[PDB]
A paper describes a structure:
Members of the family of the Tri Longin domain (TLD) Rab-GEFs (guanine nucleotide exchange factors) act as activators of a subset of Rabs that play a critical role in late endosomal biogenesis. The best-studied TLD Rab-GEF is MC1, which activates Rab7 (Ypt7 in yeast) in endosomal maturation and autophagy. While GAPs promote the intrinsically low GTP hydrolysis rate of Rabs to switch them off, GEFs stimulate nucleotide release and the loading of Rab with GTP to convert the GTPase to its active conformation. To gain molecular insight into the targeting mechanism of MC1 and to understand how the complex is built in three dimensions, we determined the cryogenic electron microscopy (cryo-EM) structure of a stable MC1 complex from Chaetomium thermophilum.
Residue numbers in the entry:
A (entry chain C): 11 to 54, 94 to 155, 181 to 359, 460 to 476, 490 to 496, 530 to 583, 599 to 624, 646 to 667, ...
B (entry chain A): 195 to 323, 333 to 457, 485 to 663
The structure:
């Protein structure tokens, strides 16, 4: 009879939206409930309204209260016994309020948070989704309001947020250690071999890519990533590569981070959206539907857009190596689309087999490290993710809870930990490089 | 951190209220008492005029949450942390700007609650809800220790003074032959360090009971500002929902001071207890133990260099999970030339501020950390780096100089436990008599 720790209510409100009581009702922009999730979950009253507006009223009181003590503006986390409440400022006055209902364990009536997702990474998760949301609508959310108007934002905001919260599992799932940082996931090979003059593995294949952005018209930058394995020639033909599941560490890392014309801050967004198509196949904002004419392709110029200050995206899909071809706003003519599709399938045809082995390159009983660089945002990761129901499921709950527990404490600087069954987590800072010499046994 | 030396001083109450609140606004620590109705009862660093205006928000915050069947637990905002404790009609809230975890404040606020209950028994505690007639100075001085660091309450244990097993046993025996039929349990203390314990066959001295006696006498009140022999009532959580238990406190003189604690469950036992001390002083002076107690108490906190030769460890701290007690090393070893009170106060506060993160790190929510190491390397000052280690059977803390590393502590930590284990009989009391 254990009740899972389902999400409670999540609200998006602007305190400066309404300065009067008649306009104070409209401060909420998006609201979610367990009942609201039910309609969207299958896809993948007046007194009720009073409680919604009243509860955010404390939040504006709470932030004003603590702002005057420590000059620290936000009351980031509100701790209760039934619902763990978090508060994050996304961009200069817009606040997201979330209430994670704890793991109800009726001991006839008991509570616990042994596996509830700790608030250290939801701020990273909510900022991820918000930055992911900003990748589909406008440059900045504040400027988005001035363009589309208040009424239009709610429809668009409800369209995306209801989708994300429909499956935002508030539990230690995936790779929380990588999720705490923003980061760019890098595969086993990581970034390709730089420079010309050495063969090595995966070195000269950048020149064709760095030359690709020159020959084809209006290409600003492309990124690739080995989410899948080589084409499986087993019994089943398709393997349904896009579908349910989660990204796998040390394997899903994006490669060929870019060439230019994309800021490192907004280069994280395109990779994160590129993560979504693999994790949520055919079901992502914009609804990517694969083209039957060319099976190794997706989306295609023929509405959808990416805001990095306005690149129209097209998706080239091999079983590994999802290609995010970012084309300019105007220069590619949509009329001549089919000619470019055949050329692109032909230009990128010889980059399937040589690139497959190239990315297969790899650089005290067991050691797992993790390198995060501040200025370039690259995330060289090795920590395995929690398996679904190399370790067992129960163990990684504690290991990934302790790894990010000490990260919040710090932010030389070396730290160390240990556990009864045997671990040695070391966080070290030196360019500032954050090495996590996580060991075991 | 920086303004700590001027932080402990009270509000001047000679300047306009505008910047008066600002002075209260930024102080490092805050302890508050507010009733279920929202009226603030006690505020330590602030007058009741200051707190009520600002603290009405908290009552407003909890009022919504209590209506929603959600007794609130605590906030956090950047550097400052807000902790809420629920005990009867009274609501306990603490504001901390230091790197203190919620568990640390829960223990600190729990001790404050115990003081209120120790003066007003549980049946009257709920019905009565100023109310805290004589505990105002008791609570105000207790919060001073928490700001100063409180290695005892933070660790939730008691100190001991270095007396050999035979010498300590002789004190217990001479403290037991002189017994009357109204000693529910009695204590002997010198400079805040427990010396001996006497217990009856059936009644047990719960270790949580001892912290009531020590906190109100040897840490906060200073034996209620001396005054000589005192006979005051008491309430104990073990002997709850009963009448005020009666405790006898008097200086054992003819820090240096040594005090004697005797407890009786009857009103008319004062003369017997007073006669009990009179026969006790004569025998202690006859043997000479009292003269020995002052010398050991005065020369407390043994030097770490004398404890361990050629060891660079700046400090030590130890605990035992069973038979709850607590040990320590020298504190005046930070800098011998330093004599002014301002650097020795910051030396203490920083020293426990080194352990304030460590205790939080070890005690987390089912995280099961065993060994914790860190390094608070200053940009230009020094390479002061902390240490740390633990066990389900005992707890150990350490501090090391710029010469650091795992071998920088494991070369010594494995034997500082042995020294505590070697000196366990002369530093920890297994039981009374």
């Amino acid at each position: 009879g254990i009740i899972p720790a389902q999400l409670g209510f999540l609200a998006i409100y602007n305190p400066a939206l309404g300065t009067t009581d008649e306009t104070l009702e409209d401060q909420i922009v998006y609201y979610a409930t367990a009942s609201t999730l039910s309609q969207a979950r299958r896809r993948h009253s007046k007194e009720e309204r009073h409680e919604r507006l009243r509860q955010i009223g404390l939040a504006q009181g709470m932030v004003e209260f603590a702002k005057s003590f420590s000059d620290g503006e936000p009351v980031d986390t509100i701790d209760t016994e039934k619902a763990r409440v978090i508060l994050v400022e996304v961009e200069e006055g817009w606040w997201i309020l979330a209430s994670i209902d704890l793991t109800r364990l009726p001991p006839a009536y008991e509570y616990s948070s042994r596996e509830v997702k700790p608030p250290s990474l939801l701020r990273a998760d909510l900022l991820r989704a918000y930055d992911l949301f900003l990748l589909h609508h406008g440059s900045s959310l504040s400027s988005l309001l001035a363009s589309q108007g208040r009424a239009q934002l709610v429809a668009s905001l409800t369209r995306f947020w209801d989708h994300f919260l429909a499956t935002w599992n508030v539990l230690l799932h995936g790779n929380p250690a990588c999720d705490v940082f923003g980061g760019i996931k890098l595969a086993a090979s990581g970034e390709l071999g730089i420079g010309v003059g050495e063969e090595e593995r995966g070195s000269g294949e950048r020149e064709v890519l760095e030359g690709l952005v020159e020959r084809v018209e209006g290409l600003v930058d492309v990124v690739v990533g080995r989410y899948g394995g080589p084409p499986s020639e087993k019994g089943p033909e398709e393997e349904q590569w896009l579908g349910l599941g989660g990204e796998v560490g040390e394997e899903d890392g994006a490669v060929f981070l870019g060439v230019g014309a994309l800021d490192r801050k907004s280069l994280r967004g395109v990779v994160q959206w590129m993560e979504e198509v693999y994790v949520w196949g055919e079901n992502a904002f914009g609804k990517p539907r694969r083209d039957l004419s060319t099976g190794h392709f997706l989306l295609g110029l023929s509405p959808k857009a990416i805001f990095v200050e306005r690149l129209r995206p097209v998706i080239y899909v091999s079983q590994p190596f999802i290609y995010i071809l970012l084309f300019s706003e105007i220069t590619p003519s949509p009329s001549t689309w089919p000619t470019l599709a055949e050329s692109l399938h032909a230009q990128l045809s010889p980059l399937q087999k040589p690139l497959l082995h190239s990315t297969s390159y790899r650089p005290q009983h067991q050691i797992f490290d993790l390198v995060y660089d501040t200025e370039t945002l690259t995330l060289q990761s090795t920590i395995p993710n929690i398996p679904d129901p190399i370790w067992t499921r129960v163990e990684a709950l504690q290991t990934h809870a302790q790894i990010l527990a000490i990260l919040s404490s710090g932010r030389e600087g070396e730290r160390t930990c240990k556990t009864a069954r045997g671990w040695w987590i070391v966080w070290t800072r030196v360019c500032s490089v954050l090495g996590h010499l996580r060991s075991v046994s | 951190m920086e303004g700590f030396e001027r932080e402990l001083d009270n509000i001047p109450d000679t300047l306009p209220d505008d910047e008066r609140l600002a002075l209260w606004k930024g102080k490092l620590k805050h302890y508050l008492i507010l009733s279920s109705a929202g009226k603030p009862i006690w505020s330590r660093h602030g007058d009741l005029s200051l707190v009520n205006s600002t603290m009405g928000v908290v009552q407003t915050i909890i009022s919504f949450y209590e209506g929603a069947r959600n007794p609130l637990l605590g906030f956090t905002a950047g550097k400052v942390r807000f902790v809420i404790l629920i005990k009867g009609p009274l609501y306990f809230v603490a504001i901390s700007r230091l790197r203190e975890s919620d568990a640390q404040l829960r223990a600190q606020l729990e001790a404050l609650y115990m003081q209120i209950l120790s003066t007003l028994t549980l049946p009257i505690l709920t019905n009565i809800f100023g109310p805290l007639q004589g505990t105002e100075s008791l609570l105000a001085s207790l919060a001073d220790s928490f700001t100063k660091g409180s290695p005892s309450t933070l660790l939730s244990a008691l100190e001991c003074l270095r007396l050999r097993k035979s010498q300590r046993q002789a004190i217990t025996n001479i403290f037991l032959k002189s017994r009357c039929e109204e000693l529910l349990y009695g204590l002997l203390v010198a400079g805040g360090k427990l010396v001996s314990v006497i217990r009856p066959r059936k009644h047990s001295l719960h270790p949580s009971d001892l912290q009531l006696i020590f906190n109100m006498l040897f840490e906060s009140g200073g034996i209620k500002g001396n005054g000589g022999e005192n006979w005051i009532p008491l309430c104990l959580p073990a002997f709850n929902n009963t009448g005020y238990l009666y405790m006898y406190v008097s200086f054992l003189d003819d820090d240096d001071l040594t005090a004697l604690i005797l407890i009786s469950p009857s009103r008319e036992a004062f003369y017997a207890l007073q006669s009990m001390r009179t026969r006790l002083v004569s025998q202690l002076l006859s043997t000479g133990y009292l003269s020995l107690i002052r010398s050991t108490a005065l020369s407390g906190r043994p030097s770490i260099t004398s404890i361990l030769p050629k060891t660079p460890l700046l400090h030590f701290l130890y605990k035992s999970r069973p038979n709850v007690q607590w040990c320590m090393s020298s504190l005046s070893s930070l800098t011998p030339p330093g004599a002014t009170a301002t650097e020795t106060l910051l030396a203490r506060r920083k020293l426990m501020s080194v352990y304030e993160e460590l205790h939080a790190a070890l005690h987390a929510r089912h995280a099961h950390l065993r060994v914790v190491y860190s390094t608070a390397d200053e940009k230009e000052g020094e390479g002061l780096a902390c240490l740390g280690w633990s066990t389900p059977a005992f707890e150990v803390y350490c501090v090391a100089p710029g010469c650091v590393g795992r071998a920088g502590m494991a070369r010594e930590v494995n034997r500082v436990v042995q020294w505590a284990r070697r000196e366990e009989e002369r530093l920890f009391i297994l039981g009374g008599g």
